[PDB]
Amino acid sequence: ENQPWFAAIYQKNKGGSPPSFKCGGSLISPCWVASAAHCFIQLPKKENYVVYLGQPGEMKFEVEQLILHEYYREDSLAYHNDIALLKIRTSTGQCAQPSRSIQTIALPPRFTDAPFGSDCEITGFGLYPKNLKMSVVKLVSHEQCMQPHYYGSEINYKMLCAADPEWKTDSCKGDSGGPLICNIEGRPTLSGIVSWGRGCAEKNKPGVYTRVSHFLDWIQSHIG
Ligand code: NI
């Protein structure tokens, strides 16, 4: 749901109507929100979007800068390098200010003993904020995909593989997207980037997430 790190990105609608909900993101820095690049590739300009933080919510930000990954590409199977950075700012010129309703979520450690983490949950639907479920999932390596029947019994959880062009993925390519959270070292962590749409909440066919840990450098190359 709405834990202090959740950011609701909206797309400024034309005319007098109200902006519509677009895709979700995570507050990784007081001045930075991470989200899916495929939510912006069709309108790549900063001024068409407004992010909301807090409990609309407790804080309104306009995006001073919109950074899509330079190697973003959509083949007919999945979104590769599907990651985007939003530098947020208020009308008063301030960035997001920490509280008990607005906190930053931890980024993946560069290295840890159990890289996949524990109790991983994806965000997604089952059109508007709060039809959003957080479904517990099972991250897997590319070897347990395409053939999980050769590794274990079937459970009612969805399996997800890290996005990779060399290994055929076949995952839903929704028009929306959001964060994948795992518990690394006992702390909630922005582990992945998933897409929201039809076929994105289904359990029997494995899906695909953009693995945040593979972009650390890139991220920090824009945050530091
Ligand atoms: Ni890895």
Numbering used by the authors: 25 to 37, 37A, 37B, 37C, 37D, 37E, 38 to 60, 60A, ...
What are the paper's exact sentences on this?
Urokinase-type plasminogen activator (uPA), which belongs to the trypsin-like serine protease family (clan PA, family S1), catalyzes the conversion of the zymogen, plasminogen, into the active serine protease, plasmin. Plasmin generated by uPA participates in the turnover of extracellular matrix proteins in physiological and pathophysiological tissue remodeling. In uPA, insertion of the N-terminal residue Ile16 into the activation pocket, is stabilized by the formation of a highly conserved salt-bridge between the N-terminal amino group of Ile16 and Asp194. In this study we have solved five crystal structures of the catalytic serine protease domain of muPA in the absence and presence of allosteric molecules and/or substrate-like molecules.
The protease domain of muPA crystallized readily in its unbound (apo) form, and we obtained a 3.05 Å crystal structure of apo-muPA. The asymmetric unit contains four highly similar apo-muPA molecules with the highest root mean squared deviation (r.m.s.d.) of 0.12 Å for 224 Cαs. Apo-muPA displayed several disordered regions including the N-terminus (residues 16–24), the 70s loop (residues 71–77), and 140s loop (residue 143–149). Remarkably, the structural comparison revealed a 180-degree rotation of the β9-strand (residues 180–184) in apo-muPA. This results in a transition of the β9- and β12-strands from an antiparallel chymotrypsin-like conformation in human apo-uPA to a non-chymotrypsin-like parallel conformation in apo-muPA. The consequence of the antiparallel-to-parallel transition is a complete rearrangement of the active site architecture. The antiparallel-to-parallel transition of the β9- and β12-strands causes a 15 Å translocation of the 180s loop with the 170s loop to the distal side of the protease domain thereby collapsing the architecture of the S1 specificity pocket. In addition, the oxyanion hole (NHs of Gly193 and Ser195), which stabilizes the negatively charged carbanion during catalysis, also collapses as the antiparallel-to-parallel transition causes an 8.9 Å upward shift of the Lys192-Gly196 segment. Collectively, the observed disorder in the 140 s loop, the translocation of the 180 s loop and the 8.9 Å movement of the Lys192-Gly196 segment, results in a collapse of the activation pocket thereby making Asp194 inaccessible for forming a salt-bridge with the N-terminal Ile16. Thus, the antiparallel-to-parallel transition of the β9- and β12-strands results in a muPA conformation that is incompatible with substrate binding.
